[PDB]
Every structure is written in C-alpha cells, then in structure tokens.
Enzyme design. Structure first.
Site, PDB file in Angstrom:
ATOM      1  N   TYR A 160       0.879  -1.154   0.000  1.00  0.00           N
ATOM      2  CA  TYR A 160       0.000   0.000   0.000  1.00  0.00           C
ATOM      3  C   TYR A 160       0.924   1.212   0.000  1.00  0.00           C
ATOM      4  CZ  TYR A 160      -3.461   3.400   2.021  1.00  0.00           C
ATOM      5  OH  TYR A 160      -4.254   4.495   2.309  1.00  0.00           O
ATOM      6  N   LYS A 218      -1.517  -1.221  -4.097  1.00  0.00           N
ATOM      7  CA  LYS A 218      -2.470  -0.124  -4.121  1.00  0.00           C
ATOM      8  C   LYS A 218      -1.630   1.136  -4.010  1.00  0.00           C
ATOM      9  CE  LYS A 218      -5.420   2.573  -1.356  1.00  0.00           C
ATOM     10  NZ  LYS A 218      -6.206   3.768  -1.839  1.00  0.00           N
TER      11      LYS A 218
END
Lengths: 286, 286, 286, 286
Positions: C128, C153
């Site tokens: 992330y 992400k």
C-alpha cells in the site's frame, strides 16, 4: 568578513542605464559594500544577453574596485567568452550558476561545464549555487569533486549546507546569499554574505556585522528581524521588482527598473510597498 | 488525436545545421508525426539565441505543414518578436513556457507576460507547462483566468493535472508531454501527445494510437512498457543528449548534436546506451 | 476491474461503533463495491489501536465477502500479529504501508519489514504505497526487489508510477488510489481502483466503469469531473473528516465520525459542504 | 544555553529495558546534558504505546531532575492522557509534534489539538516541530496564533525558521534539533540545542558550547565538522538504528536496541560504522 552586493541591473527606456548603475554602486560601496557581484539573480543574470553582461561588467569594474562577474549562459561558449572578458576588465573572480532550466543533465555534463570555465581563466572561479532557482544542487562534496572551485556563493536557507563548503574546501571563500541569514553567517564566521538587501540597506548589513564583531548578538539579531519584516513585505508584491523600489525608498535616488518577465512594479504596488515598510524604516538607527 | 514532435535542434560544431533538421522533420512526419513543435525543451529552446529560433522557425515551416513555435525568453520583448515572426512564417500556433528560473515572480507579472503574447498575434497561444523545469505551475484554473489560452501542452506525470485543462478549457486543444503517458493520453482521449520519443520512435507512438483505437488495450500497454524501458536507459545517461543517439539508432540517419552545457554524449556513454536499449528494441514488432 | 472501498472507520461517542461500520459496508457493497479495504488512510489506519483494527477485521469479514486488511504499525509485531489475525478471519489479502513517519530508515529495514510480513501469512501481501502520507516511496523496481509482493495499491497522482507496477510485476493486482484517476485507471485497464469516494458515491464509480466499458469516454470523463468538483469542496474543509459527511449527503444515513486529531466537522463546516456539493449532486443522473 | 537530549528509548528483547535507560540518562546528564527529552523522534516516540511512554516517563523522572515528555499521538485522547501522567510524575514540561501522517488536515483541527493539550495541564506545552518527519510545519506565526505555546524544539535545517520563533514568541524558550546546527545554534544564541548526538557525544556538544562562549568560534566550527563527519557515516547505514551503536562506540556501554520497523543494525553494519568513525574518533581527545 565581506558584504558582497548582488547588484541590481538598472534598466531605463528599455536599455541598461550605466549612469543610474554607477551612482548606485558608488553609493552602496560608500556605505559598507566591499565587493560588487554583477549579473547574480538579483541582477537578473539569466535574463541578460551576453552583450548586456559585457556592458554590466564594464560599468561594474569602472565603478568599484572589487568585482565578481556571474557568467552563466545556456550556451556554454558564452560563459567562457564572458569569463575571459571579465578577467581582462580586472574582475577579481568570476562565478557561475550550474547549468539551469534543463532537468536531469548528467553529472558529466555539469562537471565539464565548470572545468571548462576554470581552464578559460587564471582568476578564481566561484560556484554560485541556488537550488531553488537552478533546479539542481552542487553540494560541498560535488564542488570538491570538480577540482577547481575557489569560492562559493550559496543562496540557500540551509546554513549547514553552506558551512559544508568550508569543511570540504577549507581554502575557498564561502558566502551565504540568503537575506534571512546575514546575522547567522557573520556569527558562524563564513567569509561573508552576498545578500540582495546590500542594494537597499547596506548600512543595516554593516550594522549587523559590527554588532556581531562587538559581541552584541542581541542588536545583530534585532537588526536581522527588522530586515526580515522588510523582505517579507517585498516578497508579497514580487521580490525581484521590489528590490528597485526598496533602493529608492531607503537610499533616495532613482534605481531604474527590471525588464519583462520581471516587469517593473506598477504605481499602486510601489505606493503599497512604501507604506508597508514605513514603520520598519522609522525604527532604523543606522 | 495528434502525435506532436517536440523536435530536436540539430547542431554541428555548436552551430545550427538546418539540413540535418530538415531531413529529420521530413522523416518523422512520414512516420506518423502530425505536428512539429519547435524549440520546446527537447529542442533546447532556452539555450537558443533569437537568431537561432528564427532560423529554426524558417526550417520547420519549410519542412512541415503544421508547426507550433515555442517562444519563451527571459527577455519578454524577444518572446513577442518571435511570436510575430512565427505567425508571419505560417506557424499554426505559438506556445510559451511561463517565465522560468526566477523564484517568486508575482501573479501579475506572469499574467502580463501571457496576455502580452496573446495581444501580439492572431493565431492561437498555447500554454506550455513543465513545472519540473520551469519551477512553477500554471494549472487549469490559472490558465482559464489568463483568459486567452487556446491550447495546452502539459509536460507532467500527473495525468489528472492535464485532464483538468479539458475541464476548465473545453474548447482548448490539450496535450500531455510525458513519454510515460502516451498510451494513457490516447485512452482518456486528450487531444494528443507531445512526447520527446516522437523523435526516435514515432512509429511506436502511432502503433500505440492504433492499438487504443482498435480496443487492443493489452497491445497499447505492452508497447508503452517497451518505450518506458528505453526512456529509463536514456535517463540514466543524460536524457537530453541521449535523444540524439536514439534517433540515430532507431531511425538510421545522422541527428547532429546538442550544445553545451547540454554536451553531446561521449563514446562510452553511447556504447552503453546502445547495449542498454538493444533488448527492448528487439521486442518491438510494429 | 474492481471497485475497492477504503472504508471509513465509524466512531460514535469516543469509540469505534462496529454496527455503524457493518451497515455502511453492507450498503456500499450493494451499490457496486467489490472489495472492502479496512484500515487504510481513509479508514484512519495509523490512528487506530491494534484492538480497533482487529475489531474492524471481524466486522468487515462478517459483512462482506471480499476483504483486504491494512496492517501497518510502527511496532512491526502488531503488523505481523494483525496479518495473522486477518488471515484467520478469512481476509483474502493483507496490505501494508511501508514504515512511515521516520525519515532516516535504511533499504534493509524496509525490506525486512515486508519480508517478515510475507513469511507470516500464506495469503497475498499487498504493498500500500502512499508517498505523500508515508514520507517515502516503494516504487515498482523496489517492490519487485522485495520479491514477495502480490498486489499494489498506489495512492498517487502519477498514473505512470502506478502503471510501472504492472510492468515490473505482471502477475500482481495493481490498483490506483486517487479519486482523480478513477476514469483513467479503468481506461488503461489497471486491475481496479481503491478510491475514497467508493464510501459516498460507489454508484458514480460504477457508472464511470460502465461508461469506459461501453466506450462512452465522454460520459466517463464527464462523471469524473463531477467527482473532482465534489473532492475539491471536501478538500477545502478537511477531506478526512469530510468523507463522513459526504456519505450522509449522498447515501442518506448516519456515517459516524472520525476521531481527533482528525476532529469531526463542526456544524458550520457541514452546512458549507452540503451547499458546496449541491450543484454537482443535482447534475448527477444515476 | 542548554543541551537537551532527545534520549534513545532502550529496548532489550523487544521490550523496554528501563535499567539500560537509567544508566544511559545518568551518564549523559553527567557529561553535560541539561534536560532529558523523552519519546522524541530519536526516542522512537510515534512507535511507542501509551503504556510504553508512561514507563519511559517513570524511568526518565527517576533518573533525571529535568524531563520534558513528548506526548503526540494519532489518538489525541492518548496525548492528553500522557500529558496529565507526565505532569503527575514531575515532568517540567510536555511537547508535542503536530498531528502527523495524514495530509491536508485543516487548520481548525491542528489548532484544536494543541489548545486541548494546553488546557489539560498546568505545566508548559512546547511545540515539537519536525517538518521532514511530520509532513507539515507549524511555523512561528502559526505557533504564536495557537496562543499557548511556551517553548519550541524545531528539528529543522533552516536556522532562520528556528530564529523566527524568537521573533514571534520572544518569551518562549527555543531550541534547534539538527546535529549539523549545534555550533550555529549557540552562535546565534538560541536557548539551546535538542540534537540526537547528545546521546553519544554529549561532551563534544559541551565542548562546542564552551568554545562558542570563549570565542574560539573557529575551534567550535572545527568540533562541529568532526561531528558532521560522524553523522554523515551514521546516516549512510540508517541513522535511527545507528545512534544506538554510536552510543556504544563513544560511551563504551550497552545501549540496547530499537524495535522494528526500526530494526537494530546487523553485525556487518556495526563493523562498518566502527571503521567509518575511527578516524574522527581518534582526532577527538577533548
């Protein structure tokens, strides 16, 4: 320790006015400026053609006994040509920004640029470092790695970055170019300052230097804060153009004008600035 | 949607060579380049004299049907003069970088610069935005407020930043300037791309455009990724000088040289670049 | 391509209200959200205790079929512990921010943190990446070098940066997390989006996804720009607190509130925001 | 002028070891540390649980007469809890980072955080500003506007930024936290320094202070440069973990270790650091 003025370039009627320039240089050197730095950022250096920089070199060297000429050009042959010209006119040193504008030039390209400049002249070559304007940094280690730098002007908010040149180049003359660091530069015994405010308040910078040398840190700091307030107001309307109006305000003679994209302040901006600094002005015992 | 080449400026011995330039422009326009953008960053614009930019304007409008001339100068009178000259030579539009180098120019100074250009000519004036090189951004909101911008070239890895110009200026022709975003630009339907790689792989950009138009998204993407590997190697060695060696390697003719401080690559750097791109190049099947 | 919601953490009183959370998860998953991402930045991840994150894990896995749990902690043992806990509760994957806050961390410390995470579970571990909040970037080349990353992400305005993960990591599921890039992400066929607006306008995100698939690029872009106007208003008053009020405005139920130093919007800020989004809201047809 | 140590937090086993901590605190306070600053960035504050910070507060207030506890938390209630606990234990002041990690919190949120903290205790609240780590700055103007700030620790390379707090809050005690500015901080007469090197070379900092006070401004700079060399080397392998090894190298006792994601140095990194600082160490004497 030296007060070096990155002197304004005085346009009038679209051209350089050497009479305005000479009057200004002779005034500020009478008030404590030791060395005149021509075609620095405050002098609109990158906006000036090679011939304009030659004209400015002639004007500076005929008005002041100690002159350093900023020579950078995005045609590197022009930097070499002007460096030789400045030397022939009796400049005590030349300086250059690193190549600017272009992102991600190689280390080899930057080094070749400076080494070619050093080969071109016998007088000392200074690094003029200004990362916010140039878009790159030539730090102390890189400057040492070039192998020929004998002076540094670091227009930089990081005093440690500037001090590091003294560490890596113990024989170089090192100056900080931030108006907010004049006091601090003298306090840490840099070789001097090259601050834009030497144009409009040289007597204030001399007052700071005097105060630091007397051990009067409180007076030095107080003078510094007064200068910061003046700089802050000027930054509000376009600092580079405002420098000229600040000269008129504090020194009381015509200072000429900058040139498009650095357009002169308009009448309304000039009036606002005069009122903005009137208080700080009255507080001045210099 | 258009492929626009920010074409290289071809020097020989530090002097402009219009024959090298003409041959190059003729070749890339036969391979899918729709529009020639002269004196952009890839064309070393800020490094060129006004004389050189006028000569380049002559050569580009002679060699190409659709030409946009990039006019920025740190002497605004020169931007105005070249814009008028470009219009007289049949340029379809002029573009300019915002005033660069100088930190903290005022909003009024920036607005005046652009408005004076728009009033100087009848053909469209494009914003050429390149925050990494210029040191400031003129965003979509700011471009609308200028009130005369009819095209934007946004050399920017933030694709939403570029799309915002289409939101605020729905009638403007909007191009993204990043090589890494050619595929993405076509996929979101910007008006086109102005990517430096149009110099050395215009057929690859046309291939990406064709794939996106065919709904062949996986092909468009794998072609983009091949280009990204090439741009990466070039960036490693010094991208601006590297473009010239890539033109020769991929297009098979001489491309001339840049000029210092954008020094040409040396033999070792060129050999390195050739070895570096050889893999990716082979994986190309256009 | 997936719509992944980085779901808000619903506080009421001074404490986590798992019921409000479950209800919100149920509504948005019925409106197009495919996957629930718990304890991401929009869920105030770094402000949550281990106990709060465990509680979110239970509530999310009970209210949704597809759940990814974000596990970053500045005590790496809590990250390992929570990753194991999430796996045990049926999470389909875990994700982590790289180590944040601390500026002076080595590549070795960062690699050790992700590798220990990968060893702790058998389910996929996502990077992330969110450089603006984390203070560091783990780019595509670095993510490949870690050697165990199966998803990314990237909350990032650079679409090129996010696309690079698909280049370096062909078998990873790659998502962009910027609300301004939902349209673009679907156009370039990333694996999906993890945008904050999935909390309050999941039907708009689905409409953009449908429009891109139908080739109605003009409707997709138009919906993107309406979303942009809404995000811009929210950013004015404090985006993290504003997301909760936008859920209320657009979905019509109590969304709870954040916790200080992310203080809830006050009544004046809520009234301003409702009025600010009214026009865009009325222009919304779906 | 004071030397404030942002003391290391001393782990053994993955848990706090309050006896290594006490020995360390007692040693450095006997070698010139005036004030102990617990749970600062050097002390891994944001990595510590509330209970760990209470335990550290106990150990600091047991081992030292003057203690400032750093209380920031991304649950503001925990910041308030700790501040009240620190005061109960006899801390002379508390400090806090601004709310960190989250980008674009509002001014209202940040002000409420600090004002709520000031109202929870009757001992002074200091601002602990560290823009590089926090991702936001609370400058001197903002600090004054808060209305309750009694002290400032500014871990910042910009000395003028630090000096500004004395301009705006002349009654506040103001410290700079960069190791590279210890000499400069004393030279401009800040109220002192809060430099991480107080952990490993407190006698060097006291020597710099002494020399500035004599006026061996040139010996002070010379000692600073020796410190700069050592810092340079520690930064190369990961400064946060390296501080603990520097303590062992220069003070000759066991310092404990950090906790992951701030992983302790490995045997190889330690060997490299010892060799790297050997020369500097040899030129020390003092």
């Amino acid at each position: 320790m030296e007060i070096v003025a990155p002197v304004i370039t005085t346009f009038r009627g679209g051209r350089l006015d050497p009479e305005l320039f000479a009057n200004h240089v002779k005034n500020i050197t009478s008030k404590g400026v030791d060395v005149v730095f021509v075609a620095g950022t405050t002098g609109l250096g990158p906006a000036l053609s090679l011939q304009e920089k030659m004209e400015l070199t002639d004007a500076a060297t005929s008005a002041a006994r100690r002159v350093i000429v900023q020579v950078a050009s995005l045609n590197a042959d022009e930097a070499i040509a002007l460096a030789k010209y400045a030397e022939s006119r009796g400049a005590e040193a030349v300086a250059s920004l690193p190549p600017y504008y272009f992102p991600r030039l190689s280390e080899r390209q930057i080094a070749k640029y400076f080494r070619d400049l050093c080969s071109a002249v016998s007088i000392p070559v200074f690094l003029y470092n200004y990362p916010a304007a140039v878009g790159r940094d030539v730090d102390a280690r890189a400057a040492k790695e070039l192998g020929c730098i004998r002076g540094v002007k670091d227009t930089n908010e990081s005093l440690a970055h500037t001090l590091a040149y003294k560490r890596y180049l113990p024989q170089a003359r090192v100056y900080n170019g931030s108006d907010s660091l004049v006091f601090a530069s003298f306090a840490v015994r840099l070789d001097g300052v090259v601050a834009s405010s030497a144009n409009y308040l040289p007597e204030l910078l001399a007052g700071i230097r005097d105060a630091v040398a007397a051990g009067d840190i409180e007076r030095a700091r107080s003078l510094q804060f007064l200068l910061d307030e003046i700089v802050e107001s000027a930054r509000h309307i376009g600092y580079a153009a405002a420098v000229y109006e600040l000269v008129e305000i504090f020194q009381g003679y015509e200072a000429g004008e900058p040139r498009g994209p650095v357009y002169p302040l308009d009448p309304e901006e000039k009036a606002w600035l005069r009122a903005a600094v009137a208080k700080a002005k009255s507080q001045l015992r210099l």
